């Protein structure tokens, strides 16, 4: 629902979504789109 929206807000007002009470599935973060940039800074992108 957060990765398949239609009205992504402009940068001057960045919409914020709060994430809680789940189990974090992370294969969706991989299979979704061919992607263009996957720069991770503080957390290992595979040890997440």
């Amino acid at each position: 629902e957060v990765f398949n929206a239609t009205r992504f807000a402009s940068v001057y007002a960045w919409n914020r979504t709060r994430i809680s009470n789940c189990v974090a599935d992370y294969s969706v973060l991989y299979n979704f789109a061919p992607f263009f940039a996957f720069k991770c800074y503080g957390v290992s992108p595979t040890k997440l």
């Binding site: 991989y30 992607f35 996957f38 290992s44 992108p45 595979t46």
Partner: protein, 96 residues
């Protein structure tokens, strides 16, 4: 602390360090190798998504925080067991 030899203007990315290893490192064992960490089940060999270089830059600059400064660390290992020795300090040679 050594901020005068591991730092220069425009940065210095000479040093290296490893974060991606297949297993833990045994004591006093060197694992110098350039092998891309396997993730998922792909035999992928290279850089990019799901194929990461095992070792990342240890980039140093003269202007960092104290915890990010280029600390020079030298460890000393001693073996004091029942065997002929090699190294000592001050020594007197009173006869037996």
């Amino acid at each position: 602390n050594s901020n005068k030899l591991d730092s220069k203007h425009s940065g210095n990315y000479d040093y290296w360090y490893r974060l991606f290893r297949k297993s833990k490192l045994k004591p006093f064992e060197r694992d110098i190798s350039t092998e891309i960490y396997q993730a998922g089940n792909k035999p992928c060999k290279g850089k990019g998504p799901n194929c990461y270089f095992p070792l990342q830059s240890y980039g140093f600059r003269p202007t960092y925080g104290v915890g990010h400064q280029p600390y020079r660390v030298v460890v000393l290992s001693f073996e004091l067991l029942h065997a002929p020795a090699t190294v000592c300090g001050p020594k007197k040679s009173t006869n037996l």
